[PDB]
Amino acid sequence: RQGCEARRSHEHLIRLLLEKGKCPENGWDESTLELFLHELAIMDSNNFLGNCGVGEREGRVASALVARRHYRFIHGIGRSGDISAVQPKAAGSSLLNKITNSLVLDIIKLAGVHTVANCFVVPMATGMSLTLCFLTLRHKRPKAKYIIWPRIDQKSCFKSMITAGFEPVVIENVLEGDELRTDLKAVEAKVQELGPDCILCIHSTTSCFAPRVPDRLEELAVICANYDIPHIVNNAYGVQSSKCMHLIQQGARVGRIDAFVQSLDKNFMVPVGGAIIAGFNDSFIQEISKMYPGRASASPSLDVLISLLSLGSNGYKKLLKERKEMFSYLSNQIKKLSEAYNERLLHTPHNPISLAMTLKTLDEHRDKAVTQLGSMLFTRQVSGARVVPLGSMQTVSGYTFRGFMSHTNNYPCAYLNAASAIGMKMQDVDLFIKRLDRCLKAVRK
Amino acid sequence: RQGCEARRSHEHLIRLLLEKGKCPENGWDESTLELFLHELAIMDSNNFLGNCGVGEREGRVASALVARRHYRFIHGIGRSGDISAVQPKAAGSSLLNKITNSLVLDIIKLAGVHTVANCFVVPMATGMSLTLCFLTLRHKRPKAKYIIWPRIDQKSCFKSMITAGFEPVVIENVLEGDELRTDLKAVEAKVQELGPDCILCIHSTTSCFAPRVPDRLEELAVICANYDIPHIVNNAYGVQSSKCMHLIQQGARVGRIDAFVQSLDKNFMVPVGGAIIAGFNDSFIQEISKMYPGRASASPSLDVLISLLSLGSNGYKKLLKERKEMFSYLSNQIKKLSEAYNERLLHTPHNPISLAMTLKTLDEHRDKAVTQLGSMLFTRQVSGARVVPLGSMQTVSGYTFRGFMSHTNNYPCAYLNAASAIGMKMQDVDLFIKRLDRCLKAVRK
Amino acid sequence: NRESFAAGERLYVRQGCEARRSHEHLIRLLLEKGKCPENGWDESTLELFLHELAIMDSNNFLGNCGVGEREGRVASALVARRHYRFIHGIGRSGDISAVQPKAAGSSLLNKITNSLVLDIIKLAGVHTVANCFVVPMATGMSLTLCFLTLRHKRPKAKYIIWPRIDQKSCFKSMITAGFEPVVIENVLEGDELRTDLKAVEAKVQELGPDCILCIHSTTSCFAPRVPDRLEELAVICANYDIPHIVNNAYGVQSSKCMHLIQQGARVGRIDAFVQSLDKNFMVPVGGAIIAGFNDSFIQEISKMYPGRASASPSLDVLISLLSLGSNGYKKLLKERKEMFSYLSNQIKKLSEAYNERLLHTPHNPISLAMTLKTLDEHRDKAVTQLGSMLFTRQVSGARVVPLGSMQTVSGYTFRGFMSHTNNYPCAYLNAASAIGMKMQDVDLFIKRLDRCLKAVRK
Amino acid sequence: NRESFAAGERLYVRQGCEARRSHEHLIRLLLEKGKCPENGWDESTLELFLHELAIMDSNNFLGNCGVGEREGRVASALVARRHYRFIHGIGRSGDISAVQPKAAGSSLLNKITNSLVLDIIKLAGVHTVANCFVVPMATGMSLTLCFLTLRHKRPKAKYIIWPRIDQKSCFKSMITAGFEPVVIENVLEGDELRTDLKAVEAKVQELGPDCILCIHSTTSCFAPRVPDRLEELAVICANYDIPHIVNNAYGVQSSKCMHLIQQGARVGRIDAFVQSLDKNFMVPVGGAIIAGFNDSFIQEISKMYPGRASASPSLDVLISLLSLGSNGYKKLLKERKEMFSYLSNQIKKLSEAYNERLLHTPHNPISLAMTLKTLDEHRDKAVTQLGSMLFTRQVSGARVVPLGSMQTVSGYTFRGFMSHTNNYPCAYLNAASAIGMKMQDVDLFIKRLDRCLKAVRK
RNA sequence: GCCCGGAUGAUCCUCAGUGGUCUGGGGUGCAGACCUGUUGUCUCGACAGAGUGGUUCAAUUCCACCUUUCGGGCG
Ligand SMILES: *Cc1c(COP(=O)(O)O)cnc(C)c1O
Ligand SMILES: *Cc1c(COP(=O)(O)O)cnc(C)c1O
Ligand SMILES: *Cc1c(COP(=O)(O)O)cnc(C)c1O
Ligand SMILES: *Cc1c(COP(=O)(O)O)cnc(C)c1O
């Protein structure tokens, strides 16, 4: 009786989640999290005790390892002709989906975009979620053939436009200092050259590898509002960046943003394979949702549910704070290391996540040193250290890129990337710095 | 030393899997399965001990519940511009993907289509996987606008064509007996009316609700070979059906089949959200693969890996045998129950999975009895008992269906569905029969 | 059942929340009658029930602060999760059976477990059992706890009368308790070794009832030995007023062993009978059950345990019996008999082909023996090298018993050890049908014995 | 380290397979030196290691057939998986420390665990410890096993000399073993109750050394009592040739308790010291450690255990120490001291505001007491109703000790029970800084005591 | 004057934090002696960013001025 009244303490955390839909401020104990998950899972028809199933999709599970690791959630999210709809044969999974979308909406606000109207989790990654946006827009703009796209050398967001069946119009960037930024003149020149009606959307990018910086979203959103063109923003890993989220918030204030897309793994530290589509026009975000054919995985949504309830909005905020500190620390360590090898930290103040160290002192043409550096870093187990040499030609779905991975035809120098992304620890920078040192010292030869 | 030599017995089951790529004949013990999974997971860079990560996608995991339930597989499958490629930052997950595709290829052979050339698992469900097929074909057939589609009242495969941005041409079916079958005359009439060049593909269906039966794939594949039109087959839940798989095997022998698509949950008893795309032209199946933008979830692939290694090809074969027996048993029980209520089992010999019992004795117009029946069955926890009344109009993405859910404008009677799908148990039929009885007896009023 | 609940829902989250009621009916039924379920619970009901219990324990409370030395803090999540967050053990430090106010959930787990185990003991053959409790010690230490309890009732006692069985744990259990085992040799009656009742009485008379702590008999054992004559020994004990403690280590699985305990208690005196958890319920090693017919004496043994004890063995058997259900357990019991028939018939066969025979031991319902008279050990050491041969080919629990093996256990020296007598006529091989044996087990055994015997032929 | 392995890979599945080598180095190091890792293992290394061990056990063999009665068959997958498929317990039935040939993996788990625990005992203060073993009984039964072992060495002994501490388990442990506790009252020296050494000797002399089984002293205890004077008692024991058994239930966490055991052993005689696993290592209740300085006597206690024992407590502490590492344990120890300072300073404060005081008990490094002289219990029963008040508001392990509580434990009647003397001057309240206490624990406690005291003011 | 029930969470239950999306803890129930001004991110019932005039992206009530005032100058 002291405990059956102490169970009330759990039930109250749970009631609070379902009533107001926001993140817990402080993370739930696992005991509460798992109790909740079990409460939901037994709401799905496949877990009923007196159930019989005479259909073709009944959520039957052949292996107990599979049923357990998914907390007995088998029916996925949505129904046949709506990914947004309650599934009567899975009441528990449907509530799971509603709660996750509502938590993620809360975190998108807390992270910067306070005026987001609606969003939903979609169990495909960011590139494919961008594609779903483009496929939704086709029906709205049946005459459109082109997507105007300020260049960023990332194969997934590029292919997303081609997979959707449109032609990307690659707008090269302008080099301002060390930074590569949006060529606003060319974007509007192209809008006028091709004609608004022939434009499906402008496709911009906020999170990206230095020396590129987040696109000028405010200006681009003004162009988009003026010419009545849809604006789609690739916010692949920018939820973690108050600067990135600011732009989106501001771009929607000054102008037009139809949807912005985010990755779950890059922003929430869960496995790869999910994304969020969010926007400001409520009915439109619903339209993208209703364009998804069939049911989908509940796995990315369960990971996000589990992570945000465990972290709480305080735990998430702490991760974001720690990311800013590690950026400075990484930045200062790159500064110090570079100076010793007569290189420098490229000046890229407008990129809040990514950094670049020059590699001018390595000769790729004669000693292949730049490429060797990337190998040595990889065999010495440094992960995510993107090395970028000059003059790489690369073909991606037909389109040829000169100076590929550098985001422009002729960047001044070869360089090396490093980033401070959510969840990085001091050990990461120190090991990176130490091992980059050993590598440089060795390429001197 | 007796055990360090008994560990060799595990390592040998594992070597055999990686060398020959086929299902174990008899299922692995869990001890072997989990040892293998752990061996692979520590091959991914995120699980290295001396690893440091300075990138934006590092497979960092915030919650231990999430990392454990995925056996520490965080990086998903594929790379940015290839879903088929080895991920150097995730060697273990990549091997996971190769092995799963190779096991699934083995099971597709064992199940009937012995001449399948290539296939791959894609972590989106069947509707969306069909869409990916259509999006791949667009580039091959830039003039095409129409998909010719023998009707089947299922919202997901229908929407798949619209989501891909094509217009479905709905070819009504011919009523032969109680069965609804392909109207081969109309399909060819439409090919000629519209013109082969304007046809993206013919989109046929094998697994479906009675009284529809599997499409005449051999004939359709001959039409497709003749007019040089792509043939895409929706095999949503037909892997479990030797008859269904026969057609595909025969259709490819006599004619043309470019790809056939299957659901993971309906055929392998794992959670919803994955599918297989398979075909006979090796390079084309690779082309569909390379059309996927970005990395994707490894979750559906891990479920399938876990299930097939636990079941073995013998365990899978047993499920298939048991499904045939339960079909007869269900069929005979429906026969007996119906007779008592002056109804009958619709004669649909060509449908190997689904059955239909007539509901002529229930008046939907005046007593709403048909609809009430579906409610009562649902509140009495009968799952998957599709009730189908006459004259339902329904709009799906703009297109209006008369007689929706009946697959034709005017079927003779209202009826009730039931199916024998993989994993069904005698208890399912007996509880279904018992509860359908109570329901009928009660609607008599 | 689900009908009246359906008629109600017929007058969509309502279907689900009212489907939690199904699980609750199963739980409400368990802890209001305390019997095993007829059919096993689904895992979802099982884990639901456990999760509810664990949050009843104070260490899992949400608004909790602990200022004590035993608060149930867990350093490793791997450790906390694998125990379903049950950390406080069973009992209070003054009473292993007392409700722990700091752990209401673990107390409830313990009571329920004892209740289920009582139910099984009844269903298994001893219908008149009065009381029992799970104790997280093996059978050997649980026998010791029985002897430790009897000392206080019989303070002049030094001796425990023990019909020989060559098993080091039950033998040492007497010495650990502080008493001196009086080993009564067995009588060869046919092929089987049985209780020498005259020698027991002769020894009761020589040493004196007041000097005897108890008679310590054994039901489950390895052929050719058979269960002790509990009815006769129960009458000796009743006449001379000597307590009777029965080692029933793996005889819950045998209705012949259990009906023999029930019968002994009907015509005479049995004070407690002790059973292993792992041998009878297929859980890990380390727990036992102490059961009896005098409710208060079983409570006295319980109250003699000093301190708190692990809840791990209680939780293993609670999960197993709820998953199996009484029907599931009965089936396991029915199959054990069937596999016992099959195993002997197969051993009759195999033995014939090697000029050996199945020793006639009908009174033993679990263990069989086959002669190895063919093999010479004095010359070419063929018998002692069949033991390791069977092991190498992974035949577990196949016991090879040579002639004239000498062995010292705690200072006492056995002759013909492993054979329960000093000169059994021949060398032999053991094999048994214990609960959970599958046909594959026997077929594999026969097959490898065949290859092993053929080999020895060199 | 990873450098020379990188230079090698520099002369893509090769990066991975050679990254299994990292885990192997950690494992190769563990079982070749047997020390704790300095830094905790990652879970992936931990679960890799365990999975490897478990398949070394015969029950997990792939080509296995079992024809025995103890084959380690598991009925429930929930049960098998939560124990990492470790089913065969520890030991052979004749020796709890013997390698089980049918369970090579569990044997290796047991040896390693004992080795790690030995390492911790050294790092914790008793650097001269010779040997120890984990035993799956709590501290109470483990004390009993110590007494059961001494009986065989001292067969005329009846008595155990015990400086009083009001805790029912260690007290009953003597009675369960079959001996009669001789309770030596404590001497009030200041605020704290300490060993009455004159009364101990007076009792050794009255009863006679040969009649004493051992002296049973206690280090960890609840204030105002403090650790026994082990050095003085170790000298008494050495002079009169009486074995000395120390109840160190939760004193591994205290370097003052441990350096006091090490010191007692330097100047005199300590035969064994027994520690709880859950109080010192934050694992579930139910295991203990028996340690000593004579290697052979510790082996004799081990060899007195009859049968096989649960491996569950060994596995809990193996997981915890490998996850914590020696650095992780040291940190927990350093933080316990810090929280002990903080807890008293906070209790000094709070007490002042209520006209109460922190009893001066510097010799006790774990437990504190605050007076409750304000509250009248003879009138308005205010003290006995603060106990339940603190409980209701979920203050666990806050002990309220009234005056004149009488209590009967196993027939012996204590006066002033819970206070360790028959008339302590005042009623008081206990609180302690035990390992794993977090600042939130203290702040919450002070806060609710404040509300509780304020309330009582009615 | 002038379980200048600074309950000024009806912007200096004052009368802590940032009806015209919060005039959590605890001067309870069921600048020129008065004056003037002052019902975080980016470089039956119905109608009327401030926890969540139900500047800036009908509810305090269910910057300028005016969980009024101060349980200073003149179990
Ligand atoms: C299973 C099913 C599908 C699959 O739809 P999804 O929900 O996307 O998996 C498509 N068509 C038919 C006929 C089906 O039965
Ligand atoms: C993360 C990333 C994407 C996402 O690609 P997916 O692999 O499909 O998730 C897209 N664009 C950029 C710049 C990215 O960094
Ligand atoms: C913990 C403790 C014991 C042992 O109690 P158990 O339940 O046997 O573990 C004995 N004495 C004291 C002082 C203790 O703190
Ligand atoms: C199992 C058994 C025991 C008990 O051995 P433990 O290791 O103590 O569990 C004792 N006697 C016999 C005959 C047994 O079979």
Residue numbers in the entry:
A (entry chain A), B (entry chain A): 19 to 463
C (entry chain B), D (entry chain B): 2 to 12, 17 to 463
Q: Can you provide the manuscript's text about this entry?
A:
To establish whether mutations T325S and Y334C alter the structure of SepSecS, we solved crystal structures of holo T325S and the T325S-tRNASec and Y334C-tRNASec complexes. The binary complex crystals belonged to the trigonal space group and contained two SepSecS dimers and one tRNASec molecule in the asymmetric unit, whereas those of the holo T325S were of the orthorhombic space group with half of the SepSecS tetramer in the asymmetric unit. On the other hand, Thr325 is located in helix α12 and ~15Å away from the active site. We hypothesized that the insertion of Ser in position 325 could introduce a kink in α12, thereby altering both the orientation of PLP and the overall conformation of the active site in human SepSecS4. A closer inspection of the crystal structure revealed that the Thr325 → Ser replacement does not cause any changes in the tetrameric structure of SepSecS. Based on the SAXS data, the T325S and Y334C mutations do not significantly alter the stoichiometry and architecture of the resulting binary complexes with tRNASec. A global structural comparison showed that T325S and Y334C tetramers adopt the same structure as the WT enzyme. We conclude that the Thr325Ser and Tyr334Cys mutations decrease the stability of SepSecS tetramers. In contrast, because only a small fraction of the T325S variant co-purifies with GroEL, it is likely the least damaging of the pathogenic variants.
